[PDB]
Design a protein around this ligand. Sequence first.
Ligand SMILES: *[C@@H]1O[C@H](CO)[C@@H](O[C@@H]2O[C@H](CO)[C@@H](O[C@@H]3O[C@H](CO)[C@@H](O)[C@H](O)[C@@H]3O)[C@H](O)[C@H]2NC(C)=O)[C@H](O)[C@H]1NC(C)=O
Ligand SMILES: *[C@@H]1O[C@H](CO)[C@@H](O[C@@H]2O[C@H](CO)[C@@H](O[C@@H]3O[C@H](CO)[C@@H](O)[C@H](O)[C@@H]3O)[C@H](O)[C@H]2NC(C)=O)[C@H](O)[C@H]1NC(C)=O
Ligand SMILES: *[C@@H]1O[C@H](CO)[C@@H](O[C@@H]2O[C@H](CO)[C@@H](O)[C@H](O)[C@H]2NC(C)=O)[C@H](O)[C@H]1NC(C)=O
Ligand SMILES: *[C@@H]1O[C@H](CO)[C@@H](O)[C@H](O)[C@H]1NC(C)=O
Ligand SMILES: *[C@@H]1O[C@H](CO)[C@@H](O)[C@H](O)[C@H]1NC(C)=O
Ligand SMILES: *[C@@H]1O[C@H](CO)[C@@H](O)[C@H](O)[C@H]1NC(C)=O
Ligand SMILES: [Ca+2]
Ligand SMILES: [Ca+2]
Ligand SMILES: [Ca+2]
Ligand SMILES: [Mn+2]
Ligand SMILES: [Mn+2]
Ligand SMILES: [Mn+2]
Ligand SMILES: [Mn+2]
Lengths: 768, 379, 103
Amino acid sequence: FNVDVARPWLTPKGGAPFVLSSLLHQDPSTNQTWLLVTSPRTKRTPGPLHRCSLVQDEILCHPVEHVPIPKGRHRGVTVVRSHHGVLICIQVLVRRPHSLSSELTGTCSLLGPDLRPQAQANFFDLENLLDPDARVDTGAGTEIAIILDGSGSIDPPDFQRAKDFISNMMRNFYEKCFECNFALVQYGGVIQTEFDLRDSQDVMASLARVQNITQVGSVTKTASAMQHVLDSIFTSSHGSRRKASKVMVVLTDGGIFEDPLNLTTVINSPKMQGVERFAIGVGEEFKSARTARELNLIASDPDETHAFKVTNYMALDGLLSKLRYNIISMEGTVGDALHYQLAQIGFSAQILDERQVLLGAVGAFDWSGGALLYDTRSRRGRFLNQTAAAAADAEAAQYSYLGYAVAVLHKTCSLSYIAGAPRYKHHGAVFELQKEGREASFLPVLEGEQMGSYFGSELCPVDIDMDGSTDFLLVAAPFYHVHGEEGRVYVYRLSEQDGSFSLARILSGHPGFTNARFGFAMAAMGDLSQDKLTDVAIGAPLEGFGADDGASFGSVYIYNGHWDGLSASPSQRIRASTVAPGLQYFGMSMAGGFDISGDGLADITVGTLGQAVVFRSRPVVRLKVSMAFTPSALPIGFNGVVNVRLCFEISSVTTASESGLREALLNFTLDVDVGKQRRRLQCSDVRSCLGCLREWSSGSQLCEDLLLMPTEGELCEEDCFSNASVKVSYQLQTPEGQTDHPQPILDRYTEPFAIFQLPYEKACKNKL
Amino acid sequence: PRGQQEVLQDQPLSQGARGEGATQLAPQRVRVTLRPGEPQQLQVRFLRAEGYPVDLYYLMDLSYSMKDDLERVRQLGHALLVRLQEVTHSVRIGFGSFVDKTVLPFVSTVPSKLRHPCPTRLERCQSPFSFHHVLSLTGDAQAFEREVGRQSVSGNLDSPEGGFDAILQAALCQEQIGWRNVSRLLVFTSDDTFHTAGDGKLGGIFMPSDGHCHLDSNGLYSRSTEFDYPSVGQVAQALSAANIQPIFAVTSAALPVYQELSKLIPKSAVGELSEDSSNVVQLIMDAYNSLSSTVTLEHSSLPPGVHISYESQCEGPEKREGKAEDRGQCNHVRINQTVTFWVSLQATHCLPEPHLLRLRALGFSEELIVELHTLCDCN
Amino acid sequence: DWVIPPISCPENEKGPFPKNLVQIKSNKDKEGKVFYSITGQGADTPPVGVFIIERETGWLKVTEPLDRERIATYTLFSHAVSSNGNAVEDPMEILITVTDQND
Ligand SMILES: *[C@@H]1O[C@H](CO)[C@@H](O[C@@H]2O[C@H](CO)[C@@H](O[C@@H]3O[C@H](CO)[C@@H](O)[C@H](O)[C@@H]3O)[C@H](O)[C@H]2NC(C)=O)[C@H](O)[C@H]1NC(C)=O
Ligand SMILES: *[C@@H]1O[C@H](CO)[C@@H](O[C@@H]2O[C@H](CO)[C@@H](O[C@@H]3O[C@H](CO)[C@@H](O)[C@H](O)[C@@H]3O)[C@H](O)[C@H]2NC(C)=O)[C@H](O)[C@H]1NC(C)=O
Ligand SMILES: *[C@@H]1O[C@H](CO)[C@@H](O[C@@H]2O[C@H](CO)[C@@H](O)[C@H](O)[C@H]2NC(C)=O)[C@H](O)[C@H]1NC(C)=O
Ligand SMILES: *[C@@H]1O[C@H](CO)[C@@H](O)[C@H](O)[C@H]1NC(C)=O
Ligand SMILES: *[C@@H]1O[C@H](CO)[C@@H](O)[C@H](O)[C@H]1NC(C)=O
Ligand SMILES: *[C@@H]1O[C@H](CO)[C@@H](O)[C@H](O)[C@H]1NC(C)=O
Ligand SMILES: [Ca+2]
Ligand SMILES: [Ca+2]
Ligand SMILES: [Ca+2]
Ligand SMILES: [Mn+2]
Ligand SMILES: [Mn+2]
Ligand SMILES: [Mn+2]
Ligand SMILES: [Mn+2]
């Protein structure tokens, strides 16, 4: 129909950007149109948003400046548009100290109508941002190195006590510290590693080799033991991590004897920077001050709580007090409840006004969902969720994913927000914000019919006549199953009197494809038919998967709006194979309704997976057709000339229609005396009247004079006194040549034929 | 001259499991003396005394919520294998596993928990994975018991578990799972709802799943993080295309979720993995007992001038109305059921006096032998 | 650490010399070779070498006869070093009394 699949503009194949979604944006105050595209992060892509405009019949792209910068893996980029501005959200990862699980919330930047930056938002510590009275308007780890003195001068009982201390500390640290890893060394005489950091990955094996270690007597080399621990255990060559905090536990009798390295040569060395030290006195030979001084020099600077005796198993708290961890309750374990840690605010979004935005929160409260109504100016918002106070069992509402999609409804009285919950009771539901007293909560209004269909994953209100109300609401069930996943899209008429929903139609793709995923992407494309109603577009990304050579697959359907609602059958079906090769998943994102091509008509955009296509639209010419005869009424027994005049003209005009009207062709035939066994009127040039093919020059008019006359041979004798009827049938043929302009098209909903009458003069008192 | 028909050997039917103890067809030898325009007839009977072969993939969830239920699955495997091996001589049983995708919202990504997902470091555990094929379909029962008795639990972040990916990959990975193309059964164990297509969006996975095999050499579905979970439609289509009947042995709490899935996947069955676990074994025996066959009578090439035809009769007086070659087949035979046939032979002219031919059931080891004597001359 | 009983050497004994009074025993000797060097007034400062110690055993020996009534007591110390040159035991202030003969 309108869409000009002849000349599609494509972003360069393979190279950047990698388009995940495309949307056109027009600045109201400047009438500039850009084709915005979001892309994931790579070593080549400069950012998550680009603006691309058509120059030299090529789509050229640049990065938007003040958008937030993604980092690390791809985790979601949302871009939504309204005549007030653009809102771009990026899912980001943050880890807090001593937390064993990470948070995942959004970072959003609101640019104005001209893509300059206006507002910023970081949804960490959401409990601060919340104001539950806000009116809703509607109009590294640690590593411990144990250096154990088996030098002799330590009777076996003391060795066993030290061994027990090691085992007890190890067990407690494994029980109550998760990111703790251990090492062990024994330096009586030679230095002898008993197990390494790499062994500590197995708690049972490391704990088991403790109680099996044997003594080595000889001589007390503390300095060499510590230097070896620094040089061969706290090093990456033996599994030591760069950022992990490092700790030591010297378990010695403080009797240093025959050691080459001054113990100050080691404690003041470069490598001991940043390494904690705990001393412990094994046995009892602290009769003199030398042992105490050595033991404390081993101990870190704050000698309090850094020197002990093996008998005090409570010695190494502080480490166990500071290294305590917390877990988000996960899949069978006890822990902190999920409130806002993984809310994913910004998953969906809708700009309501210059100040306020509405953000989906699919993950809040065990993935029940919600939506944060965020006032960017004051930086405060309200959380809107399903009410759990009616019945104490909120478990029935977990994993609903309310907020997977969000929309608004512009009823004649007030706005009314709706939110899709594509896993409600495993069917899916569409919620509507209802307000009563001092409370405002979501309640279930529509429900799906099949498990796993994802009913409510996409919503598209449509104002069919552009009057401020919302007449229909389209709800998507992209994974509906009959044979495969064909998809399905419901069409809910919206009542003006009551504001409730009533079903009108169920839409399904062209038969023969089992995996279309019809309903994945819906976008009200504004006015493409140039007739002041709202047309819709529905995508089917997987239509054609694996067919033939697999060059391209996908489809997009166009549903022209009508006075009584959305049309019954699509007016067009763009197929991937007819646009260009290499298009895969053509139809996953769609937008349009603005002039990006350079002429007054609206244009569409359909993003594939990895490319964006832009389609111009064609003028619609509806032809006025009129005629006259000579003589006006057939005389009695007329054998004379029947001269005709057949004048054509245009009935609706635009600049584009003027630009393109004049390189297509008109083709019209004349059928004379319709419906009779035999005709009364010839065509003096049979080749001509039965078929003509003319070219159209200027202005709006193109007329022709053609000749008829009485049928050859004997004249009719059975129907002389009745009227004749002449039917003109016109078709418009468009060459494929390289005409710069989009060539016109006749209206699909208007008859291509027009019928006139040629009377006859009866013999009665009144001829006609 | 006149024709004659005769039987040359005797053999009764039997009910053994193995070929020597089993009987498939009528006695082995007969004789027929044909003459021009004088057809003669023979009678045949068939019995399926042996059982069909079977293939059985046991696919169990190894998330942490299953720690209390692992005794049940470990016993279910044994109680299933004993029953099946008491009936069919040639069972094959495999084993696979699954936890979830390795992306943040589903599985924690911090390295410490990625190595040791369990709450405490004293627990015996294993790193998360999406699908880990552990034992290709084999006749070694002891291997299956030893392997199923060795796996350890993993962790996860969300109650939904991604077993749909495992089912799809089991369906699509035929060459390395080890399917024999005979009869297939999948026994899927879990105690949680399942992820479906659309859930991957939360983890940033945009690429729709595709119907191709993605098992590494070690058996892991490594590329899982890059594709979305399959839709129930895709799973149904794949299982149907591969003729696999699923049997969801699911906990009494996750049973209501899977009893609606049973309606979409047509041939499936759902049971409760109780402490007794006889109901699931009975379901699997009912699935095995659904197997039926259509028996056809093959025959050897006839000598010049000779012809042949068939007739069949099912249980009861029922015949087959399709004449000629159609009556050479009988359908809907199950365990220890029997059917019968009549084969007619005719001669137009003689060329060799002696001859021989052979017939049998379609693809069966036992066969029949016919000795022909076609004559033109007078007595 | 050290193991030393109270110390005394009577007045003006009969020879010959040296004579053993007490033993200056260290503690880390179980790991080996704790050598000695007595010092202080009386050993390495006048009166010269009145008391000297054997370097390995630790025997404190009197070198020549004594009298209190010239000096009442002789304070002393002991360095104690290992074979690697590092000190082991810090000095302990021995204090010997020539116990009077009531004359
Ligand atoms: C950007 O494009 C829009 C849409 O075409 C333009 O809006 C149009 O603005 C004109 C005035 O500039 C509006 O009035 C027109 O004026 C005269 C009578 O005064 C007459 O030629 C027309 O009948 C018309 O009334 C016009 O209604 C308005 N169109 C719409 C649909 O609202 C806008 O001006 C453009 N902006 C710039 C900066 O050029
Ligand atoms: C809808 O959202 C409301 C909040 O706007 C949810 O109610 C809240 O539910 C949480 C569940 O954890 C309650 O948290 C409480 O916090 C502490 C710390 O654990 C403790 O007192 C309790 O054990 C409990 O966990 C919270 O009090 C409660 N109310 C408020 C005002 O926050 C509600 O659950 C959501 N409904 C659904 C269906 O998701
Ligand atoms: C003008 O349009 C008419 C249809 O409105 C064309 O008529 C067709 O002519 C072909 C032969 O050329 C016939 O086989 C078809 O049955 C006719 N009708 C249709 C609907 O195709 C006519 O050909 C056109 N003229 C030119 C010059 O192309
Ligand atoms: C550990 O026990 C083994 C025997 O099981 C023994 O050979 C070894 O010496 C013991 N000691 C250590 C430190 O492993
Ligand atoms: C099963 O049959 C298919 C289709 O004929 C064949 O390609 C395949 O090799 C066979 N075996 C297996 C294990 O799939
Ligand atoms: C060690 O260094 C100190 C000064 O830090 C020095 O006095 C001492 O002699 C050195 N040697 C020993 C054995 O302590
Ligand atoms: Ca309206
Ligand atoms: Ca329209
Ligand atoms: Ca245009
Ligand atoms: Mn020692
Ligand atoms: Mn459980
Ligand atoms: Mn689980
Ligand atoms: Mn999970």
